[PDB]
């Protein structure tokens with residue numbers, strides 16, 4: 210849970226994601242008017258680097274909150290950089306902790322999971338917004354989108370599914386039923402994309418509620434190559450827009466530099482032929498799992514069949 | 521625990537490890553005299569492929585035992601290959617389950633973890649041997665070794681340790697103390713090896729006891745390149761020897777084809793210069809962690825400093 214985030218390993222991976230970390234750095238350093246003399250809340254501050262960016266940009270006060278043990282490392286790091294007079298770190302869940310202020314001017318966080326919403330803390334960020342954001346205050350990143358794109362990769366498909374038909378001369382076909390419903394997080398070869406992307410979800414963190422994060426979308430994939438469609442890929446775009454002189458965007462899609470989010474891939478049980486110029490129609494719904502509500506399920510209808518996928 | 525092994529993902533990885541899986545296949549198919557008309561116990565049978573190898577080689581009966589939910593998939597797989605009359609699958613811990621026989625002729629398993637002994641079930645295999653192996657019976661694989669080799673990789677070292685000194689202009693040096701004591705599982709470039717390997721441990725599964733698996737060894741690394749020594753790497757070799765006409769060996773060392781075990785790397789807090797022809801002397805001790813006894817610690821003394829490492 211918060212246990213995983215107690216270990217340095219995930220923090221190292223996020224910090225070495227240059228697209229991710231340089232986007233936040235650029236947003237703050239190139240829009241210091243958003244931070245100068247402001248009270249900033251960093252929801253899930255981790256190692257504290259985002260809090261230190263906000264302090265450097267002239268924040269009056271930064272409150273860094275994390276439930277994980279990493280906050281004790283943040284505490285030493287803030288002291289090592291001599292920022293303890295500007296940055297106050299608080300251990301606990303943003304849902305329960307006591308803040309030395311009633312309201313904040315700005316909320317910043319990196320809450321995004323695989324396919325944007327997996328094991329994401331947007332729900333925790335929205336709690337902080339509704340309870341703590343001042344009237345006329347701002348939350349960043351402010352705008353997110355989710356997109357789908359069609360994939361043709363018969364070899365990758367055969368590696369994951371057809372593999373189980375003959376394993377050292379033995380049939381293991383009954384394994385396919387456990388494999389198909391698990392989404393795969395992997396970097397896609399952009400040469401395997403056979404459609405234009407379709408946006409299925411737009412979120413503004415200023416106006417969205419937790420109930421908006423379970424959604425359905427009809428979609429149309431404009432096919433660009435006559436091929437066997439073997440999978441649908443998902444990815445997301447992150448925007449820093451509100452009150453920016455220097456807007457910042459990053460994509461986690463396969464046409465962009467890879468990030469630690471990679472892409473999320475939903476393998477089709479039955480690949481099917483498509484033709485260039487075809488308008489491929491489908492439906493996708495995202496639900497919070499009843500068991501672990503940090504677990505998503507994604508229901509995909511395409512080519513007259515429906516499959517539910519989890520991460 | 522057994523929970524991780526309930527999921528197909530780890531079984532797919534082990535089965536697609538050709539060095540691992542073709543070694544077991546070759547051992548059984550090229551030494552069928554070991555199996556013909558024998559009663560075979562497969563300790564931790566997983567998906568059941570090893571049990572099916574033993575049946576194909578003419579086993580009278582194969583008992584496949586696994587604590588994990590994967591055993592239910594094994595049950596369908598054995599039925600799909602029409603081997604249910606030869607292979608009996610039993611769900612539970614080999615330590616507690618009831619077997620329809622008092623003794624077995626042969627025990628087979630794949631128990632090996634990172635650095636041979638991490639989260640390894642050799643203890644469970646030895647329980648099965650001491651309780652169930654007939655007089656004059658055989659256990660496979662029968663012989664294992666662990667080796668160390670010296671590494672020079674200043675860039676990899678700087679990527680993992682020196683990285684934390686300056687992260688986007690902020691000091692994060694206090695992170696180094698969490699990083700140094702974690703062993704890294706990774707495939708090494710064989711060009712970075714700067715010593716001959718040194719064997720630190722020989723196990724014969726016929727004669728070894730659980731108490732032998734906590735051990736100390738003095739070692740000498742024959743340096744082959746004047747360089748900065750940045751790490752010590754560990755790996756292991758697996759032998760099928762007893763009563764074989766066709767002996768089988770595989771190595772998980774960096775001079776051999778990569779396996780899912782890769783190599784285990786112990787980064788040095790203070791890299792130090794070595795000269796070609798130098799006899800580098802050290803000491804290594806392996807202990808079962810007091811907290812999780814599936815967790816090892818490795819204490820390494822080299823160049824007049826000592827560090828304890830965990831996985």
Ligand SMILES: Nc1ncnc2c1ncn2[C@@H]1O[C@H](CSCCNC(=O)Nc2ccccc2)[C@@H](O)[C@H]1O
Nearest residue numbers: 214233253254255259275276277302303319330333
């Ligand atoms: N309800 C919750 N209340 C309190 N903490 C919670 C809650 N839910 C989750 N968490 C924590 O949120 C973190 C998400 S991972 C981001 C670490 N922070 C960064 O890298 N930031 C950064 C660095 C550079 C650039 C941009 C950002 C974990 O540490 C969780 O322990």
Ligand SMILES: Nc1ncnc2c1ncn2[C@@H]1O[C@H](CSCCNC(=O)Nc2ccccc2)[C@@H](O)[C@H]1O
Nearest residue numbers: 525544564565566570586587588613614630641644
């Ligand atoms: N005390 C215990 N009692 C019962 N089961 C236990 C115990 N400790 C651990 N386990 C299980 O042992 C497995 C180790 S992973 C190997 C799967 N088997 C293979 O791939 N075999 C194979 C395939 C091809 C070639 C060679 C071998 C897991 O499924 C655990 O659930």
